[PDB]
């Protein structure tokens, strides 16, 4: 389990984000996303993350879901 903790340089430009976007046959909308873990950048439509380190969290057992062992 991993949440975010640091970004190094987010960069959004709704201007190009409009242009990058497209319409499926579904009629819905989407765009392309790329991850380059050698460069540690994610890019999607008009937003690109650079250096988005995240990190581990503890799973908190919820003891109301303790199964019955017979």
């Amino acid at each position: 389990l991993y949440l975010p903790t640091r970004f190094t340089s987010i960069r959004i430009d709704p201007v190009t984000h409009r242009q990058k976007l497209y319409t499926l046959q579904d009629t819905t909308q989407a765009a392309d996303v790329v991850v380059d873990r050698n460069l540690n950048t994610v890019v999607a439509g008009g937003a690109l993350f650079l250096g988005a380190h995240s990190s581990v969290a503890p799973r908190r057992p919820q003891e109301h879901l303790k199964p019955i062992l017979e």
């Binding site: 873990r37 050698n38 460069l39 540690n40 950048t41």
Partner: protein, 70 residues
Amino acid sequence: GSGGVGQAAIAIALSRGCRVFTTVGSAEKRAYLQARFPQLDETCFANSRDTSFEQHVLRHTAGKGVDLVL
């Protein structure tokens, strides 16, 4: 490596067989260097007007990075 201490810092490192990565402002500076130090690939050259060089160095480094930065 266009500049003063760069040029030397290159020569010193090359003498010892180190993979070099230099950055440069001008097209013509790529020129000079390439001539002078022949042992230089085109992979060696990134930009300096910019932050681009982080990307460039992270490619040919396999996201491993460099050993010393001057």
